[PDB]
Amino acid sequence: TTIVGVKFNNGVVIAADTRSTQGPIVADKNCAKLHRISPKIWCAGAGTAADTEAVTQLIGSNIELHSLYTSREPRVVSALQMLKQHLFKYQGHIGAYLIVAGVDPTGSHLFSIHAHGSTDVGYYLSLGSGSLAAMAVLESHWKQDLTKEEAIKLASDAIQAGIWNDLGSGSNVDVCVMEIGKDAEYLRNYLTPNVREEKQKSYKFPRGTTAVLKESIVNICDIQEE
C-alpha cells in the first residue's frame, strides 16, 4: 500500500493506490483505500484491510452522533483523538495505519496515525509498504505554499512512485481534495495507468463443452397462494 497526504494553500489532499494483496497474490485490483469519516474529513488506510475499514466506520459513526449532539461540524482533532485512544487500548492488535486529513471551522489539518496509537503532525506524510518510494518523491519536490493543482500533482506522483517501485502497491491512483469553504471532491480512479492489453485469443467455449449430470430449477420465490 502507498498512501499520502499533502497540505496546500487553502486545504489538504490525500491519495492512495488501489491494490490489495494476500501474500504474493493480488486479491483486488481496484480496491478503495480512501475512507470517509465525515463529509469533509477523509482518511487513507494501510495495514489490515478489515481493521482500517472497521475503525473508520466506528469513529465515523460516533463522529456523526457527536456532530448531531453538539450542533457543530466535526473536527479533525476529534477524529484523531477518538482513533488514537481506540487503537492504543487494543495495544497494536488492531492493525490500522491511517493518514487522517480534513477541513473544519478551525482550518485545514493533516495527521498520521499508527496501530499502537501514536500520532504525528506534518505538511506531507506517507504510510504503507510503498511509503519510502513515496516519501522520496515528497522530499524531492515538496515546497511551502503549494497551489491546489501542484499538490494534486505531487500527491499522485508520490503514489505512482509506490505503484511502479513497490510490489505491495499497484493499479490506479485515488485522490480526495478537501479545500476550505468548499465541498470535498472525491476523485475515484484519478489516474488509470495500468489497463490490461487486449488478449491474443478469445476463450469463449462452444455451448455443450462441459459435461452435466443433473439439471433442476431452484425455488427462490416464497410459498405460493392457492
Binding site: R19, T21, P24, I25, V26, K29, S129, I163, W164, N165, D166, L167, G168, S169, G170, S171, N194, R196, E197, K199, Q200, K201, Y203, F205, P206, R207, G208, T209, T210, A211, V212
Partner: protein, 222 residues
C-alpha cells in the same frame, strides 16, 4: 543466524510443439517487496539447440546454468564434438542437482529443445533432481496460476464436443508456433495481473531445426 537461501521471484513456461519448442520467462528480478531489475534475462541458449532456465533462488539458478553450459563444453571435448541430445542433457542435469542433495540448488529447472526424431521436447526438474519429459510445464512463483490454464487450453482437459454432452472428448489437434505464442502471452498477461512478482517484460526463446530465435514483449510494470 545466516540464511544461505533467498527468493528472487519470477516465472517460467515451457511448451512442446510438433516440430518446435518454446521456453518463456518474465524478465523481472525481486527481493521481498523491491524490484532489483526490470530486465534480467532468465532463459538461456546453452548450445546444441538446447534452451534452459533455473527459476527460484537466482544465485543457485546462475550457478546451475553455468555448470550445465560447462558440461556441454566438456561433452564436446570428451566425445568428438558429438551433439548433446535433449534426453542426455536432462539426465546430466539430474546428477548436477542430486550431487547437492543435502544442500540443494533452490531452483525449479526447465529445459526445452528437439528430440532425436525432430519432435518438440520439454523436460522439468524439481530442486533435488527428479525429472520427467512433458508436453507442457510452468515453473516458479505463478506456476499455480498458469498450469491449470494450460491443462485446459493445450491438452483440452474437461472439454467435450457439443451435442454429445460429455460422451465424446474434444480431439487433441496439434498447435502451431503462432498458436502457442498466443497462449504464452495470455498466460503471462494473466499472471502479471494477479501475481506481484510477475511483470516488466516477457522473453520467449523458440527452438526449431533452423536454430534458436528470440521474441520480446512488454509486460505491466506495477
Amino acid at each position: 543466524q545466516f540464511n544461505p537461501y533467498g527468493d528472487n521471484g519470477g516465472t517460467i513456461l515451457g511448451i512442446a510443439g510438433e516440430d518446435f519448442a518454446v521456453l518463456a520467462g518474465d524478465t523481472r528480478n525481486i527481493t521481498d517487496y523491491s524490484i532489483n531489475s526490470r530486465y534480467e534475462p532468465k532463459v538461456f541458449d546453452c548450445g546444441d539447440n538446447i534452451v534452459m532456465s533455473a527459476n527460484g533462488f537466482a544465485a543457485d539458478g546462475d550457478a546451475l546454468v553455468k555448470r550445465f553450459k560447462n558440461s556441454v563444453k566438456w561433452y564436446h571435448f570428451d566425445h568428438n564434438d558429438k551433439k548433446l541430445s535433449i534426453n542426455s542433457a536432462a539426465r546430466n542435469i539430474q546428477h548436477l542437482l542430486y550431487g547437492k542433495r543435502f544442500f540443494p540448488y533452490y531452483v525449479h529447472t526447465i529445459i526445452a529443445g528437439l528430440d532425436e526424431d525432430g519432435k518438440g521436447a520439454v523436460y522439468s526438474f524439481d530442486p533435488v533432481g527428479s525429472y520427467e519429459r512433458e508436453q507442457c510445464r510452468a515453473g516458479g512463483a505463478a506456476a499455480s496460476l498458469i498450469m491449470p490454464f494450460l491443462d485446459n487450453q493445450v491438452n483440452f482437459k474437461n472439454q467435450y464436443e457439443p451435442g454429445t454432452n460429455g460422451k465424446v472428448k474434444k480431439p487433441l489437434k496439434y498447435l502451431s508456433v503462432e498458436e502457442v505464442i498466443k497462449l504464452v502471452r495470455d498466460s503471462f498477461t494473466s499472471a502479471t495481473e494477479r501475481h506481484i512478482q510477475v511483470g516488466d517484460g516477457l522473453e520467449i526463446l523458440i527452438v526449431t531445426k533452423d536454430g534458436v530465435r528470440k521474441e520480446f514483449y512488454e509486460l505491466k510494470r506495477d
